[PDB]
Symmetry: C2
Subunit: 194 residues, 2 copies
């Protein structure tokens, strides 16, 4: 089983992916948690490059996809083969929202590149943790992190556009507190999982 | 002006690109020489990863394209804008020959990815240094390097297929000695140097 969390930073998707991981592990599922970019030896080397270097948006996209390619081949496909629940903190929708709607690259091209990196592996469900940018930015300020309002407003709109067209994407109201957000994630997951 | 050398290892394309660089620079052209992968700070970090790590063919392709994206944006496009002669040791045909014909990835997909990485920048001329694999392998043995005959036979065929299809590709007989090969490169270049 594959479960993708998607959303902007400050949307609580790291916290909520961890909550689901612990909850499912308590219920007796064998669980994996991976973050994009990263999650493999080579992927963390690329993560560092993506964080450190000044990178044009095309090179940035290609390196993100390379991290995802490695993760898919090295871990996700074997994990899925032995019936693990695989939880991703970020996956393919975030690439389209950030690189496409945000930095202006072609959305159809990004999807085809996602498909290449994943070898067609799609989530059984995607949870979009939708949140107003102002609220996201407030929660980042509490961690002394600052991101660009104008950029994230485009990205948020991109995410909501993608939710209407893409199948198996449930829009979660991430403006709520942790416990409402998690119960809404549980409800959304009852379709995919008994 | 953009001049691409393409071919398998042991085809003499590194030596001959360097010979052309020196020759054109002596004639008063402003010249650049870049190798793929590599040629930028980030590109050489990726070159090392491509040489060191065991990498699946999809991740490998994406990293090659990332190196090319960086090189194109950071150096080739500015170099071309100020009328430098840019010489490449490997470019887009080598990716298609190695990743497509060699490792079996989709050729149309590789071309679309090449186009994305280069932002449509095409060479004014491509020199295919065509050589029998046995002769290539002999010259690698003299450097204590050993590569796979069965793999390079597919790649060579890929290169010759691409020469018939792609425009501005001149097939050079790289089985010759250095001085014949270089004079044949000079003749092939007389169109672009006029």
């Amino acid at each position: 089983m594959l479960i993708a969390f998607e959303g902007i930073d400050g949307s609580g998707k790291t916290t909520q992916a961890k909550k689901l991981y612990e909850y499912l592990k308590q219920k007796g599922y064998f669980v994996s948690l991976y973050r994009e970019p990263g999650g493999t030896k080579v992927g963390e080397v690329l993560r560092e490059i993506l964080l450190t270097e000044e990178l044009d948006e095309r090179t940035e996209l290609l390196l993100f996809e390379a991290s995802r390619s490695k993760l898919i081949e090295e871990k996700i496909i074997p994990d899925l083969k032995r019936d693990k629940v695989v939880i991703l903190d970020r996956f393919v929708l975030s690439t389209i929202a950030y690189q496409g709607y945000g930095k202006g690259l072609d959305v159809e091209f990004i999807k085809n590149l996602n498909e290449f990196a994943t070898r067609g592996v799609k989530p059984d469900i995607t949870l979009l943790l939708d949140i107003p940018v102002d609220i996201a930015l407030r929660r980042l300020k509490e961690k002394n992190e600052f991101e660009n309002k104008e950029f994230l407003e485009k990205v948020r709109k991109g995410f909501l556009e993608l939710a209407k067209e893409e199948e198996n994407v449930v829009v979660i109201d991430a403006s709520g507190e942790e416990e409402e957000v998690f119960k809404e994630i549980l409800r959304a997951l009852s379709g995919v999982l008994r």
